[PDB]
Design a protein around this ligand. Structure first.
Ligand SMILES: [Ca+2]
Lengths: 56, 225
């Protein structure tokens, strides 16, 4: 991994809000919000971090 | 589709639809009179510009209105952790000039029942590799689900201030960029786009703030501000 910012995701629901607040993964994917990057991660055995804010 | 199972529609069709802009479109809203907009509380930011009469959010077609928000009032019991009371009021700096593409939506008098079909709108689009972004103005007709089936989809998560709408088989939903926008059932505002587990997934319908619970709060808040 080539890092520098985790996603801070503390949701008490098993869902994400439908706001467009993009973050650029270190994988090169644009996540439509940080909660989406979180949920996507939790079914990964290796977490993508946040490369930059805004679309890649 | 790329429009999350919906169909394209224009600003004339949904003239109460607004865009909330902070350098880019992040949420929708609904116009409830010439000076006031209703959105989702999680859409709160400082320095929102409201964009009215938009057909394309990327192109200035010479018929839109750009108005700064003067005041944003988030429901005092909004809980960001549970998304309960996910409703915000926005006062515009000046009144909108109302026309065919810009008009306000009535507030409900009673709550809507399960199986009432509604119209959900917004600029939420989804690309190929499941990546959501705003662009094309789309519309979607969806039923309101029973409370049983909603709580069965999201066990422990659904409060008295939420409802589910959509299709248990998936394919058609609202998605990221649609937050805060309208769910209109027989000409009244019955919902605000709030959350979901992904978009258009099987057995995971969208979850909306139940606007009928809030009509007195909205009317008294507007009237005292
Ligand atoms: Ca435009």
């Amino acid at each position: 991994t080539s890092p520098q910012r985790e996603a801070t995701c503390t949701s008490e629901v098993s869902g994400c809000p439908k706001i467009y607040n993009p973050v650029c993964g270190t994988d090169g994917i644009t996540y439509s919000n940080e909660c989406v990057l979180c949920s996507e991660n939790k079914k990964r055995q290796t977490p993508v971090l946040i490369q930059k804010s805004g679309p890649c | 589709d790329k429009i999350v199972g919906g169909y394209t529609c224009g600003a004339n069709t949904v003239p109460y639809q607004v865009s909330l802009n902070s350098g880019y479109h992040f949420c929708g809203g609904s116009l409830i009179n010439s000076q006031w907009v209703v959105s989702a509380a999680h859409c709160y930011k400082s320095g929102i510009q409201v964009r009215l009469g938009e057909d394309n959010i990327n192109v200035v077609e010479g018929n839109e209105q750009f108005i700064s928000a003067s005041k944003s009032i988030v429901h005092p019991s909004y809980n960001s952790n549970t998304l309960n009371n996910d409703i915000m009021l926005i006062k515009l700096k000046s009144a909108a000039s109302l026309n065919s593409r810009v008009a306000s939506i009535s507030l409900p008098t009673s709550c809507a029942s399960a199986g009432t079909q509604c119209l959900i709108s917004g600029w939420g689009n989804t690309k190929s590799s499941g990546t959501s972004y705003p662009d094309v103005l789309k519309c979607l007709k969806a039923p309101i689900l029973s409370d049983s089936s909603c709580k069965s989809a999201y066990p422990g998560q659904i409060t008295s201030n939420m409802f589910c709408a959509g299709y248990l088989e998936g394919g058609k939903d609202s998605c990221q960029g649609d937050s805060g926008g309208p769910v209109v059932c027989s000409g009244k505002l019955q919902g605000i786009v709030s959350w979901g587990s992904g978009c258009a997934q099987k057995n995971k319908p969208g979850v909306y703030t139940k606007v009928c619970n809030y009509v007195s709060w909205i009317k008294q808040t507007i009237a005292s501000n």
